[PDB]
Paper text:
The patellamides are eight-residue cyclic peptides containing oxazolines, thiazoles and d-amino acids and are derived from a ribosomally produced precursor peptide. The patellamide gene cluster has been identified (seven genes; patA–patG) and the majority of the proteins or their contributing domains have been assigned specific functions. [name] has been shown to be essential for patellamide production in vivo; however, to date its function has not been confirmed. Cyanobactin family members related to [name] have been shown to possess prenyltransferase activity.
Here, we report the crystal structure of [name], the first from this cyanobactin enzyme family, to a resolution of 2.1 Å and provide evidence to suggest that it is likely to be an inactive prenyltransferase. The crystal structure of [name] has been solved and comprises a β-­barrel core surrounded by α-helices, which is a known motif for prenyltransferases. [name] is a globular protein with approximate dimensions of 45 × 43 × 53 Å. There is a single disulfide bridge at the C-­terminus linking Cys276 and Cys307. The final refined model contains residues 3–196 and 205–307 of chain A and residues 2–196 and 205–307 of chain B. The missing residues are found on the connecting loop between β8 and α8 and also at the N- and C-termini, all of which are presumed to be disordered. Electrostatic surface-potential representations of [name] highlight a highly electronegative central pore that could disfavour binding of the electronegative DMAPP. Two key interactions of DMATS were identified to involve Lys187 and Asp178, which both play a role in binding DMAPP. In [name], the structurally equivalent residues to Lys187 and Asp178 are Met136 and His125, respectively. These significant changes mean that Met136 would not form the same salt-bridge interaction as the lysine in DMATS, while His125 would have a repulsive effect on Arg66 (the equivalent of Arg100 in DMATS) rather than a stabilizing interaction. Our data, together with the lack of prenylation of any natural patellamide, indicate that [name] is an inactive prenyltransferase.
Author numbering: 3 to 196, 205 to 307
């Protein structure tokens, strides 16, 4: 009985995270946000909700969430949530989804024992056609996962140097599939470091001093590469929110997100996603700010 009651309370907290974020950042409940809220209520067990704001100068896009079960391995049953969501979204008039890459990856690795889960997520854009479904595959850190990374690399179809190919083949811990509602899709390969030594080395040899001076200060460092990206997007994960001002200076919108985060409970970690190029600037104008809340808080 107590497990059942706790289970209903997690579901309520999940929704409250998502709603509190909409309130704080003036997000309109535009398609597909209502549908997404219904979808995450169907996830069993305890979930983490990772909300974010994409900032672009004085523009802020706040209707961005990734949700997943945070209690061990739910692959491949976690796929059912993704497919249900995609089915609901595709049936919307004026929405077109190219799910080929995700379907092929899912088909290929359904029986893999090296995958923790997939997430489900949505990113609202300024208009319907710029909005997307976002799906991340989280790979087990302590497995040799070259075969997963190869499949993703093939679906991405980018051409990388020998050095970067090895980083991607060996240290990829997350794979992103972004499905835009105008029919564009993207595959992100996500090498991470606390796996990691190839990314660390690549970073030390190739990336700016500013990147090198901060990337080991959080508990995790990641970079997303894609054929679609001229340069990777770098992610800096921190478990102590108050440490962010030590390493980043924000434009006004970033300060607002930062302040909001420091007043909110239940936050287990934050991340700043930014390009090397944008990190060179005196102030961050173009970046994404992520924060993660656990529904048992």
């Amino acid at each position: 009985l107590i497990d059942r009651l706790q289970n209903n309370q997690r579901k309520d907290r999940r929704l409250q995270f998502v709603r509190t974020h909409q309130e704080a950042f003036d997000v309109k409940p535009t398609f597909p946000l209502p549908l997404f809220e219904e979808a995450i209520l169907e996830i069993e067990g305890s979930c983490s909700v990772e909300s974010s704001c994409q900032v672009e100068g004085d523009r802020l896009q706040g209707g961005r969430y990734e949700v997943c079960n945070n209690q061990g391995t739910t692959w491949p049953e976690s796929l059912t949530h993704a497919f249900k969501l995609l089915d609901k979204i595709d049936s919307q008039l004026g929405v077109r989804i190219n799910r080929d890459s995700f379907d092929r990856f899912a088909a290929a690795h359904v029986n893999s024992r090296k995958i923790i889960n997939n997430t489900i997520g949505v990113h609202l854009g300024s208009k319907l056609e710029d909005s997307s479904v976002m799906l991340y595959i989280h790979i087990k850190p302590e497995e040799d996962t070259e075969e997963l990374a190869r499949t993703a690399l093939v679906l991405d179809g980018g051409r990388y140097s020998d050095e970067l190919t090895r980083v991607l083949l060996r240290d990829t811990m997350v794979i992103g599939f972004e499905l835009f509602f105008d029919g564009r899709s993207r595959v992100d390969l996500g090498p991470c470091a606390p796996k990691g030594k190839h990314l660390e080395q690549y970073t030390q040899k190739n990336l700016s001093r500013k990147v090198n001076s901060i990337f080991r200060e959080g508990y995790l460092f990641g970079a997303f590469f894609s054929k679609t990206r001229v340069e990777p997007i770098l992610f800096f994960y921190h478990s102590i929110i108050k440490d962010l001002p030590k390493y980043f200076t924000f434009n006004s919108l970033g300060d607002k997100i930062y302040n909001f985060c420091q007043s909110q409970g239940c936050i287990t970690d934050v991340a700043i996603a930014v390009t090397e190029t944008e990190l060179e600037k005196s102030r961050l104008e173009n970046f994404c700010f992520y924060y993660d809340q656990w529904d048992e808080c």
